[PDB]
Design a binder for these strands. Structure first.
Ligand SMILES: [Zn+2]
Lengths: 127, 317, 206, 103, 67, 37, 63
RNA sequence: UAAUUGCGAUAACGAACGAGACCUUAACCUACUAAAUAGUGGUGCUAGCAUUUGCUGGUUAUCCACUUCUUAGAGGGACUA
């Protein structure tokens, strides 16, 4: 029973489920590496949860991500949020509390949507 | 020559009123706090003049606000009574709910576990004083209150549990009640209060009862003698009472401040009122809870501005 | 910079560029200069973004708009003509291209060039068509710093698009061209032209 | 020995849940093996309807709605228990279906 | 304008007129108190009334009211 | 035609009900279609 | 070139026939002893910063 | 005052229906109480590539646990705090 932590991420009806277990240190969205995202411009966005807290935090965890719903952008935001969330949750349950909170501090300092989903739900057209 | 309480700083991490506090005996560095943010926070304190170091854990599991909490004598478990009509048994280490106490039909307002950590009482707003095991099993249903049950406490034995297992409750039917849980029946009816009793606590030895509420009357009874002693005027509403572990002091949580009385010699020791920034005087936060430390030198106070303010006893000129 | 090897490793250039305290791959926001006090707090961008692509919800508050990145702001003001509407990837890539040009235009800091363009192209005082009784004269007003920056980015993007239409030049090159003729105003740019004319008719009408 | 699947469809959730909890507790109180009342998504059937009845005024639009809820419970019992339970559980508003096959 | 309908204002008036003691500045206790003292047909309208008795309770602790 | 009021016009020929919109709006509550939103 | 710096301290309201230009009282930045009456074509707040050219020009009311 | 909505002054004082409101809906719930006609993880059966753990799959029942995502609710929740 490898220590695993599952956390989701939503943007505009696009959800990404992230399975952070204990491995050699591998990061993959939809069975493909995080290095090769469909949008080549939005690329760095999916990097921003890996860079904002250091690149070593991942040497102990293998991170999975599966994305359904939305388009390309909606799912980029979905998977970066799923990544950040999965990280701070694995750090909450497994690593100590101060590490996890320095991680959420690092995340909230730059983008406050990395830990909280988008609060602009599609408007009812109002008949 | 005075014995002075000094404001040692603030503990903030809550979103709602700090409604309960409980200290530890195994580890005097641990403080459990139940709040109206539907979470309990356990703190490991590093006592400095302005700030206090580490906020250890959060206990999210209660659907509605958490009203009362208690630790164990070692400091390994937590017991939370919520408005979701349920109680819970946490691990202060990990946050693991070892058991959910489901039985009440309304908001659970208070909880306390006995000396040997094996009998868990609970008082709620459905006028029911239920008694559970540590496994989640209700083995008693003590009805008797005709209004709310604002507080249930277990009285500290002095003869090393010589078959006498007593608990004291404070109803909003303007009465205090003493139950014997050996056959599950009423043992004493303390009548005397003129309004709603908000809190009650048993002295360290197990022979004194302090009950106060909305009238502002901190009434002292003798439980071993089962006779009314007297009444101290605390003017405004008193929300929480507590007896000092070493001294003969009684600190009450009044809508104005925190009134610390003495019982021998009889005088008001202190009236603790912290400075508030930008508030009217009918808008100043009051003390809703308070917990005494393991040596009687520290007084923790859970307020209504979501901040746990702390005081420490010194000795003046 | 102390590199870290994972199973699927982050490319070394990323690690290097971002642990060298560089906010893009070829640029940094720690080198940005504002001239007037009025522009300092309405142009302010001190958070490092690698994409200039933010899910900004600043359209809910009027001043909140001034806390959204100015390169993301000029990026979304690229997207003006009706055929290019709803395409932010195009504008972002185009802005990245423009920044690839201002570097090879012998300018060491493209970001300060753009900010100095924004500083130079926002009209101090303007005119308004106040009544006066039928034949409406023009009262000389003094436009706000917010609308100064607005009108700046506007005149820039519009001048550059108006130049890049029906000529072989790509939009990034006339956008760099405009932003550099306006970085240090030369009266060969559209934005400095229009600014000077607005302030001229504001001057003549007081 | 019959292994049967039951499916309910209803618009009023109170009658549907009445029948569901009835079949659940009645199936367990006489000892049967079952899969609990699984809850299919409430499909909301909507109908777009023009505000304009008579050709006076501009055209603006409106919407009508219906909520359709569906449940299913799986059981194993003889012929008589199924017959009797099907006859006893019949309710208005709620539509019950009893299928015997497992393919 | 979030002007409270006459039922909420009148019920607040009466509830504070005979039950001034048990009400404080807090809505959370005035609410369950509005459950135990009154019989309101809806939770929403009870939150309405109890919340307005909360505001009014914050207005009576400063001075004497027209009631 | 509308199987209620001799009307060639207004026909909701959908789902095989064939009531014109005027009569179908009236019989809507007896059929099952109610006003939610 | 004369670049005068201004500080919108008091919002007076909205004027003009269209109702868009803001009447504004200005605290001069470089010489804090000068307080000008200025008209702004744009969205202004309190304690803002303008850039005028003629600080000695005032504006009573707009039609 | 959004209002003949109220406070107040007052040869006016009541009381009815208008307005609101009753009604039907939305967005948060890692807390309830619950799933092969939804899905996730683990496990077996199994494929390929690396082989040093690894990577990407196949298996509508091989089993187990979950509902964190989907979904029937119950609650809550807002009261202009
Ligand atoms: Zn017809």
């Amino acid at each position: 029973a490898v220590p695993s932590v599952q956390t989701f991420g939503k943007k505009k009806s696009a959800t990404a489920v992230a399975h952070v277990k204990a491995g050699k240190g591998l990061i993959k969205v939809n069975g493909s590496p995080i290095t090769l995202v469909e949008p080549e411009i939005l690329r760095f966005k999916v990097y921003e949860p890996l860079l904002l807290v250091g690149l070593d935090k991942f040497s102990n965890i293998d991170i999975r991500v599966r994305v359904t719903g939305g388009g390309h952008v909606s799912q980029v935001y979905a998977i970066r949020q799923a990544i950040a969330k999965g990280l701070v949750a694995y750090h909450q349950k497994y690593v100590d509390e101060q590490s996890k909170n320095e991680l959420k501090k690092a995340f909230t300092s730059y983008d406050r949507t990395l830990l909280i989903a988008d609060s602009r739900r599609p408007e009812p057209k109002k008949f | 020559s005075n014995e002075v309480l000094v404001l040692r700083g603030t503990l903030e991490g809550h979103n709602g009123w700090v409604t309960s506090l409980a200290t530890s005996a195994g580890q005097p560095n641990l403080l459990l706090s139940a709040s109206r943010d539907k979470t309990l926070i356990s703190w490991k304190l590093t006592g400095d003049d302005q700030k206090f170091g580490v906020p250890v854990r959060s206990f999210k599991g209660h659907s509605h606000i958490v009203q009362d909490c208690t630790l164990t004598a070692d400091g390994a478990y937590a017991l939370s009574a919520s408005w979701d009509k349920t109680l819970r048994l946490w691990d202060v280490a990990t946050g693991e709910t070892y058991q959910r106490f489901v039985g009440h039909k309304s908001d659970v307002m208070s909880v306390d576990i006995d000396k040997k950590a094996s009998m868990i009482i609970s008082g709620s707003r459905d006028k029911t004083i239920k008694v559970w095991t540590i496994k989640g099993q209700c083995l008693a249903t003590l009805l008797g209150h005709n209004d709310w049950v604002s507080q249930v406490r277990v009285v500290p034995n002095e003869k090393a549990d010589d078959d006498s297992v007593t608990i004291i409750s404070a109803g909003n039917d303007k009465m205090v009640k003493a139950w014997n849980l050996n056959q599950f029946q009423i043992e004493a009816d303390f009548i005397g209060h003129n309004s709603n009793i908000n809190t009650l606590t048993a002295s360290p030895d197990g022979t004194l009862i302090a009950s106060a509420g909305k009238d502002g009357e901190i009434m002292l009874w003798n439980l071993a003698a089962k006779k009314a002693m007297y009444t101290l005027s605390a003017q405004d509403e008193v929300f929480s009472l507590a007896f000092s572990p070493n001294r003969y002091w009684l600190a009450a949580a009044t809508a104005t401040g925190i009134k610390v009385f003495s019982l021998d010699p009889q005088y008001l020791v202190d009236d603790l009122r912290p400075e508030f920034a930008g508030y009217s005087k009918a808008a100043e936060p009051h003390a809703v809870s308070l917990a005494w430390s393991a040596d009687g030198q520290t007084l923790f106070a859970g307020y209504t501005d979501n901040v746990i303010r702390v005081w420490q006893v010194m000795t003046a000129n | 910079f102390t590199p870290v090897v994972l199973a699927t490793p982050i490319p070394e250039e990323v690690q290097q560029a971002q642990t060298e305290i560089k906010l893009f791959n070829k640029w940094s926001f720690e080198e940005v200069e504002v001239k007037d006090a009025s522009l300092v707090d309405y142009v302010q961008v001190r958070q490092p973004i690698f994409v200039a692509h933010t899910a900004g919800r600043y359209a809910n508050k009027r001043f909140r708009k001034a806390q959204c990145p100015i390169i993301e702001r000029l990026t979304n003001s690229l997207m003006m003509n009706g055929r290019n509407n709803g395409k932010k990837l195009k504008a972002v890539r185009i802005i990245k291209h423009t920044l690839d040009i201002i570097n090879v235009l012998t300018d060491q800091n493209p970001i300060q060039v753009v900010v100095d363009a924004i500083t130079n192209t926002g009209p101090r005082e303007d005119t308004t068509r106040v009544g006066g009784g039928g034949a409406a004269r023009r009262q000389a007003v003094d436009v706000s710093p917010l609308r100064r920056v607005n009108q700046a980015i506007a005149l820039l993007t519009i001048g550059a698009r108006e130049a890049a239409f029906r000529n072989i030049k790509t939009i990034a090159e006339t956008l760099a061209e405009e932003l550099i003729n306006a970085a240090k105003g030369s009266s060969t740019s559209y934005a400095i032209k229009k600014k000077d004319e607005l302030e001229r008719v504001a001057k003549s009408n007081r | 020995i019959i292994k049967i699947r039951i499916t309910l469809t209803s618009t009023k959730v109170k009658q549907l849940e009445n029948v569901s909890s009835n079949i659940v507790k009645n199936a367990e109180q006489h000892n049967l093996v079952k899969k609990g009342p699984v809850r299919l998504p409430t499909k909301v059937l909507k109908i777009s309807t023009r505000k304009t009845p008579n050709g006076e005024g501009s055209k603006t639009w409106e919407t009508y709605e219906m909520r359709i809820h569906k449940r299913y419970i799986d059981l194993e019992a003889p012929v008589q228990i199924v017959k009797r339970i099907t006859q006893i559980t019949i309710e208005p508003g709620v539509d019950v279906e009893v299928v015997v096959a497992s393919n | 304008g979030r002007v409270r309908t006459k039922t909420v204002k009148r019920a607040s008036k009466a509830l504070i007129e005979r039950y001034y003691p048990k009400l404080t500045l807090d809505f959370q206790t005035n609410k369950r108190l509005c459950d135990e003292i009154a019989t309101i047909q809806s939770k929403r309208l009870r939150n309405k009334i109890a919340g307005y008795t909360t505001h009014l309770m914050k207005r009576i602790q400063k001075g004497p009211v027209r009631g | 035609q509308c199987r209620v009021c001799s009307s060639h016009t207004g026909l909701i020929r959908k789902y095989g009900l064939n009531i014109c919109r005027q009569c179908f709006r009236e019989k809507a509550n007896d059929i099952g279609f109610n006003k939610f939103r | 070139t004369p670049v005068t710096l201004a500080k919108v301290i008091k919002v007076l309201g909205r004027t003009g026939s269209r109702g868009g230009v803001t009447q504004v009282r200005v605290e001069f930045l470089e010489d804090t002893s000068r307080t000008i009456v200025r008209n702004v074509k744009g969205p202004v707040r309190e304690n803002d910063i303008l850039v005028l050219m003629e600080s000695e020009r005032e504006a009573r009311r707009l039609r």
